[PDB]
Design a protein around this ligand. Sequence first.
Ligand SMILES: [Ca+2]
Lengths: 96, 48
Amino acid sequence: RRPWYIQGAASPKDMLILVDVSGSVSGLTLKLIRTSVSEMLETLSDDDFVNVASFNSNAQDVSCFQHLVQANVRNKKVLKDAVNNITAKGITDYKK
Amino acid sequence: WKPFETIILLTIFANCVALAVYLPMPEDDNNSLNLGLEKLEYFFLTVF
Ligand SMILES: [Ca+2]
């Protein structure tokens, strides 16, 4: 998980985290999903671009970004704060 | 007087089976089977 190892282990990424927020993920799995999303966000550097989206019968962004961002400290903080606010409600739709 | 009650008993058993296979989901979630059973619920209602 060290920055030098991550830099030397692969190439820069254009990552899009897709989060399921349908009703079935309510409970323990939603909290685990939030923690996992934060942990994976912690694996990105300034050369990677990331955005987080959620879908429950309809897909939308979780923050005020609306596209990929540089994934620096401030953007990652915003994404983490937005992610640790989601609620499980609705019906899953993977196509959308 | 014809064995009509047997058909009603069989359809009651079918309704009980349909109730058994229903899978409750949290926070207004569903799957294909639950939607299929909801439509089948009208068939029992019409017969009854
Ligand atoms: Ca679901």
